[PDB]
Design a protein around this ligand. Structure first.
Ligand SMILES: [Mg+2]
Ligand SMILES: [Mg+2]
Ligand SMILES: [Mg+2]
Ligand SMILES: [Mg+2]
Ligand SMILES: [Mg+2]
Ligand SMILES: [Mg+2]
Ligand SMILES: [Mg+2]
Ligand SMILES: [Mg+2]
Ligand SMILES: [Mg+2]
Ligand SMILES: [Mg+2]
Ligand SMILES: [Mg+2]
Ligand SMILES: [Mg+2]
Ligand SMILES: [Mg+2]
Ligand SMILES: [Mg+2]
Ligand SMILES: [Mg+2]
Ligand SMILES: [Mg+2]
Ligand SMILES: [Mg+2]
Lengths: 52, 159, 185, 235, 130, 15, 52
RNA sequence: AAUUUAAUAUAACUAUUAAUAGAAGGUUACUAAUAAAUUAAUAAUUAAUUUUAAAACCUAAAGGUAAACCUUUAUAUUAAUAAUGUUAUGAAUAAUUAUUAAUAAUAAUAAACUAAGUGAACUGAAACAUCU
RNA sequence: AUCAGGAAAAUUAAUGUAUACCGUAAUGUAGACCGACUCAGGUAUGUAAGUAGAGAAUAUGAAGGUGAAUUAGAUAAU
RNA sequence: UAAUCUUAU
């Protein structure tokens, strides 16, 4: 990773809202991951335990 | 970036049905400078996608992969371009080798003379093109250039 | 006798290289000076590769007592360093010989004669060194017999003219290159 | 994720081993995958390998857009226009009339105009399970000739009914791709010829560009022998 | 507690999952002694000095040459309404590398002077000679 | 498959 | 006449003035580079006049 | 039309018999792509035969090294020209770029079978030493 | 003082110099290394506030760091 | 002592 210094400044555009952009919305993949964790790591009577 | 967007949405991206990578045959009849420009445009597009793709994978942890597919497609076009560039050089080298064989060259010259030159029912234009094609004579000096001059003189004498 | 430890030896059969064929991956730097010796180079009594041992390898066998208690012993040949005169080379050649080999040399009437005997047995019981010596002697004999005439200057005369002609076209030309060009001509 | 794996090819052998799992332990591999996936995501059909995948339009017996009768199922004897195929599974997604399943869905994936979490979604179905229509259904279709399509822009085959070859089942004319993107070059510029093979003296692309085009130190490209080299080699 | 949710002694480590693992795995730039220098194929540029410095050799430095007149109208993708073109080289065993074909093309150029092909003229075309 | 279907549905809703 | 760092600075200034490279261009001409770069978001430690 | 039984798969090893022939791994990235021809068959085709592109780094043997790195400088000389700017007196001396000709290079290679060299001991002899 | 103390890699003048690669976190008398364990063991170097002193002994502790995967009570016999 | 052998340049 290479930092550079430049004679004119720059600031990034502001990241989009959850409702606006389809891709930039971390809720879904994180939820999916959580569900996977629950299901694989569920052992005995935690099968009956309701999902998060 | 692309239109100053932190991230292209699904609608902002170009759809898969509308977009196609370049065909090798299509690339084959493009000039060197044009091909070079195309390559650099491709590279620029990849960079834009790479920035975005990284953000998607590293931060949000997505598996949507449209950007990745686009990058792959661009990479395909790039290697096709690279292939056609190599292929053209090889073809040129083969032509040079063929010309170096003397009898074959002589036959080719005879064929040229018979059909289009020394005939009626433009000639100057053909000669100027032929000059550039076969010898080092535009409108600097070498054995090849001399040979071309001699050939031109011979043609003039004939006509 | 037999030449089992010699004629058993096998060497990798080199493929005959055509002028237009593709190269091998490892081509050597310096060229082959001597001819290939049919029976390679001994891979057991490597002591004997440096000299004229007369196909006499080391034996291994058993020391046996009055009790017949067997114990492994080895039986070396009677090797000896000996500078012997070559008439062909006009110098004496110093090498390790078996006393037997020295006796054979004496019988045959010279070292060159011993080397150059056309029988296969002799060839077998020459070493790689012995083979090289033979080659040296034979080549020298051939030279003595047949000097080149019984061309170089012509080449030397033509060379500068050829170089000038090349320059007139546009390219430079070296001697070595000229020599390479006009070897077969 | 916080990965960085995607910018490299690290642990390559391990990845290969994982990727190319033996086929006799494929049930083992997929059992846990099935468990992991929610009901609305998971499919009943087998995810076939890219080798055994219908890439050609001959291999697929039907194209997205054509009308097909469903059979060997719950919604059997039902006409349905096939919407889009799935590439990994080797199957079709039909319209509303085809086979479906009602499954709960989170508010991330809610359509506009929904009261309940419960939503009916179309299940995938194989080409074996459904037969063409033209009203008359077709038992089997065969391909014998080929031609350039104007709309599809491909040298597609002729779908002919099995037995009588003259009864052609025509391909469905697709929707017009109205292209307006900045990353797609237009037809005129895309194809305009700017190069011609003219010179034998001047090479077309410069000498300093060659190293990018091909590796000058290629271990594969063996040199040709000469007479001198032969002489050096041979004793 | 190292972590407050784990009050009791499970067999969990202070950091990571397993202490053990395959030690035989290639070195990186970070590992080894002060003297251990791996490098990253980045700098066969100049030459190391007798005193420990470095002197760049600019004839052996990578420039990235960009075309002076950039054709921006060429894009990374083509419009899909254009079909993918297909060349045909019948009567030429060498194909596009065939010297005879090249000679023919040169002859054509000489005669006519930069005439565009079937595919280049007509976008509806899909197959072509050149 | 489901994701693709959902995307298609969204597109339809949009247009 | 003048020290090395000062000379370098002067050269850089001259290149800027030109609208030419502000640095000595190399001879190893890469026409078709395949390298991509990922423009990162700025950290707290960087300014608006930096990019990594 | 469906079900069952037996056989066959790109998708098991082992033994036998018959027939035929004598064959890349890893590392991580600026990912290591292909293009064609002729003939037969059924324009696209599948099949056969032939040509052709690219292909990083490491795997003793270009030179090193602490495998996947470093250093050599073939996007090199050396010469011949052409264009450019400087020095000293139309000719001479050095530097940069672009053509033309000349100069070298890339060992990852099986294992079993065969032949040769050297050649044990446990063990058996109801011990052990010849013998085995 | 005897115990008698490494090796190996020039200078003026003119012309240059756009300055490569790798290391840099934290841990390191230790829960982050070697000891099968967050193991009273083993682990190289330099600073190591002042007051006291012969001192790097000993007491204190400015600053800094720390008070812990066991707690609460009871404190028989031992 | 031009049998052998050891050393140095
Ligand atoms: Mg261990
Ligand atoms: Mg370290
Ligand atoms: Mg330094
Ligand atoms: Mg190697
Ligand atoms: Mg070193
Ligand atoms: Mg044996
Ligand atoms: Mg016994
Ligand atoms: Mg006993
Ligand atoms: Mg550190
Ligand atoms: Mg620090
Ligand atoms: Mg440890
Ligand atoms: Mg212990
Ligand atoms: Mg401890
Ligand atoms: Mg103190
Ligand atoms: Mg305190
Ligand atoms: Mg601490
Ligand atoms: Mg404790």
């Amino acid at each position: 990773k290479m930092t550079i210094e430049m004679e004119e400044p720059f600031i990034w555009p502001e990241e989009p809202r959850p409702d606006e952009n389809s891709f930039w919305d971390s809720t879904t993949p994180d939820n999916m991951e959580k569900y996977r964790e629950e299901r694989l790591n569920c052992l005995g009577s935690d099968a009956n335990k309701p999902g998060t | 970036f692309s239109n100053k967007k932190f991230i292209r949405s699904a609608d902002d991206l170009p759809p898969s049905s509308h977009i196609r990578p370049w065909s090798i045959p299509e690339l084959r009849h493009k000039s060197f400078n044009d091909l070079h420009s195309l390559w650099y445009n491709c590279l620029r597009e990849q960079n834009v996608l790479a920035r975005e793709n990284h953000l998607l994978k590293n931060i949000v942890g997505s598996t949507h992969d449209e950007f990745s597919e686009l990058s792959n497609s661009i990479r395909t076009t790039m290697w096709q371009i690279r292939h056609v560039l190599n292929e053209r050089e090889l073809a040129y080298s083969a032509s040079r080798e063929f010309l170096q064989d003397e009898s074959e060259r002589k036959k080719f010259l005879d064929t040229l003379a018979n059909d289009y030159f020394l005939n009626k029912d433009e000639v100057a234009s053909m000669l100027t093109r032929f000059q550039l094609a076969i010898f080092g004579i535009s409108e600097t000096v070498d054995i090849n250039f001399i040979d071309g001059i001699k050939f031109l003189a011979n043609l003039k004498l004939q006509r | 006798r037999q030449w089992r430890l010699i004629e058993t030896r096998k060497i990798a059969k080199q493929p005959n290289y055509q002028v237009g064929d593709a190269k091998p991956l490892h081509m050597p730097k310096e060229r082959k000076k001597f001819p290939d010796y049919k029976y390679g180079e001994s891979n057991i009594f490597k002591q004997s590769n440096k000299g004229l041992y007369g196909g006499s390898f080391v034996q291994f066998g058993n020391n046996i007592s009055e009790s017949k208690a067997k114990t492994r012993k080895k039986w070396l040949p009677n090797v000896v360093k000996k500078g012997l005169w070559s008439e062909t080379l006009n110098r004496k050649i110093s090498i390790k010989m078996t006393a037997k080999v020295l006796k054979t040399i004496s019988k045959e009437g010279g070292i060159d004669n011993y080397l150059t005997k056309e029988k296969s047995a002799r060839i077998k019981e020459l070493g790689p060194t012995g083979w090289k010596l033979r080659y040296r002697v034979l080549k020298r004999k051939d030279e003595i017999e047949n000097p080149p005439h019984k061309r170089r200057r012509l080449m030397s005369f033509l060379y500068p003219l050829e170089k000038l002609e090349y320059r007139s076209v546009g390219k430079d030309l070296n001697y070595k290159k000229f020599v390479e060009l006009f070897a077969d001509v | 994720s916080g990965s960085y794996q995607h910018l490299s090819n690290v642990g390559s052998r391990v990845m290969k081993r994982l990727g190319n799992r033996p086929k006799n332990f494929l049930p083992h591999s997929e059992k846990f995958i099935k468990k992991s996936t929610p009901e609305f995501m998971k499919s009943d059909l087998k995810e076939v390998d890219e080798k055994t995948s219908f890439k050609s339009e001959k291999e697929w017996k039907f194209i997205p857009g054509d009308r097909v009768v469903v059979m060997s199922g719950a919604s059997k004897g039902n006409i349905a226009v096939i919407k889009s195929f799935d590439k990994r599974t080797n199957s079709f997604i039909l319209d509303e009339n085809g086979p479906t399943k009602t499954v709960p869905v989170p508010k991330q994936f809610w359509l506009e105009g929904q009261t309940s979490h419960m939503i009916t979604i179309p299940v995938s179905i194989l080409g074996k399970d459904l037969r063409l229509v033209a009203t008359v259904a077709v038992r089997d279709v065969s391909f014998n000739g080929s031609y350039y399509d104007a709309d599809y822009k491909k040298v597609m085959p002729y779908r002919c009914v099995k037995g009588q070859p003259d009864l052609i089942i025509p391909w469905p004319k697709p929707d017009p791709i109205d292209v307006q993107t900045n990353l797609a070059t237009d037809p005129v510029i895309a194809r305009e010829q700017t190069f011609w093979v003219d010179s034998v003296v001047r090479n077309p692309i410069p000498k300093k560009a060659i190293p990018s085009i091909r590796n000058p130190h290629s271990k594969y490209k063996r040199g040709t022998l000469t007479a001198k080299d032969i002489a050096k080699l041979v004793a | 507690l190292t972590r407050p949710w784990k009050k009791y002694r499970d067999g969990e480590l202070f950091y990571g999952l397993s202490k053990v693992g395959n030690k035989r795995v290639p070195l990186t730039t970070k590992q080894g002694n002060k003297t251990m220098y791996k490098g990253t194929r980045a700098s066969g540029i100049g030459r190391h000095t007798k005193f420990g410095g470095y002197v760049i050799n600019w004839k052996k430095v990578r420039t990235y040459v960009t075309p002076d007149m950039v054709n921006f109208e060429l894009k990374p993708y083509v419009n899909a309404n254009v079909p993918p073109l297909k060349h045909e080289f019948k009567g030429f065993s060498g194909g596009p590398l065939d010297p005879r074909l090249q000679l023919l093309k040169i002859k054509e150029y000489i005669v006519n002077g930069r005439v565009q092909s079937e595919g280049a003229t007509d976008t509806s075309c899909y197959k072509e000679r050149g | 498959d489901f994701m693709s279907w959902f995307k298609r549905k969204k597109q339809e809703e949009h247009q | 006449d003048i020290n090395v760092s000062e000379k370098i600075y002067k050269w850089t200034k001259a290149g800027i003035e030109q609208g030419k490279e502000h640095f000595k261009v190399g001879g190893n001409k890469v026409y078709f580079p395949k390298a991509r770069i990922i423009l990162l978001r700025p950290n707290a430690k960087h300014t608006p006049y930096q990019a990594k």
